[PDB]
Amino acid sequence: KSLTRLQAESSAAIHATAKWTTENLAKTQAAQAERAKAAMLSQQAAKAKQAKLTQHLKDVVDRALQNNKTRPTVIDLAHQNNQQMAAMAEFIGRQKAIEEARKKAEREAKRAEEAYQAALRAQEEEQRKQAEIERKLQEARKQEAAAKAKAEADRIAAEKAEAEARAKAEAERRKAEEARKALFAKAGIKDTPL
C-alpha cells in the first residue's frame, strides 16, 4: 500500500478509538446522572424522616410539661403523711418515666438528623462526580472532532495522491506518443483518411 493510504488507515483507527472513548464517557455520564437523581430521592426521604422524629420528640416534651402540672406540694418534710409521700413518689416516677422516653426520642431524632446530613453530602458528591464526567466528556468530544478531521484529511490526501499518480502516468504516456509522432509529421510524413 502507498504511504498516504497507510497514514489514512492509521488515523481512521485513531478516530475509531476516539469514538469508543466518547461513547464510554457518554454512557458514564447518563449512568452518573441516574445516581445523582437516586441520591436526591434518598435525601428527600431522610429529610422527611428527620422532620417526623423531631415531631415525636416535641410530642414527648409536651407530655413532660403536662405531667409537670400535677406536681404535688410537700413543704413540711419532717411531718410528711402517707398520702402526701405517695403523691410525691408517684409524681417523681411519672416524671422519670417520661424523661426516659424523651431521652430515647431525642437519640432517634439525632440519628435521623445525622442521616439527613449524610444523604445531603452523598447528593453533593454524586453531583460533583457528574460535573467531572461532563467535563471529561467535553474533552472526549474535542479529541474526537480533531481525530475525525485528521482521518478525513488523510483519506482525501490518499485520494489526491492516487488522482495525481494516474494523471502523471497518462501525461507521460501521451507526451512520449506525441514526441514519436512529431518526428514523422515534421519530416512531412502525414496521416491519411481510413
Domains of the chain with CATH codes: 3-186 (1.10.287)
Residue whose cell numbers read 424523651: 102
Residue whose cell numbers read 489526491: 160
For the four alpha carbons of 11, 17, 23 and 28, in that order, the dihedral sign comes to negative
Q: What whole-number distance in Å separates Cα of residue 60 and Cα of residue 188?
A: 128
DSSP string, 2-63: -HHHHHHHHHHHHHHHHHHHHHHHHHHHHHHHHHHHHHHHHHHHHHHHHHHHHHHHHHHHHH
- What is the residue type of 191? D
If one counts every other C-beta atom within 10 angstroms of the C-beta of residue 140, the result is 22
Q: What whole-number distance in Å separates Cα of residue 134 and Cα of residue 33?
A: 10
188 torsion bin: left (phi>0), alpha (psi -120 to 50), beta (else): left
Tally helices (H) and strands (E) across the chain: 2, 0
Q: Name the structure determination technique.
A: X-ray
Q: What whole-number distance in Å separates Cα of residue 33 and Cα of residue 132?
A: 11
- What is the residue type of 41? L
Q: Are 55 and 142 contacting, i.e. CB atoms less than 8 angstroms apart?
A: no
Cβ-based neighbours of 165, under 8 Å, separated by 6 or more: none
Record the cell numbers describing residue 164, joined without a space: 495525481
Q: What whole-number distance in Å separates Cα of residue 25 and Cα of residue 139?
A: 10
Q: What whole-number distance in Å separates Cα of residue 114 and Cα of residue 120?
A: 10
DSSP string, 147-177: HHHHHHHHHHHHHHHHHHHHHHHHHHHHHHH
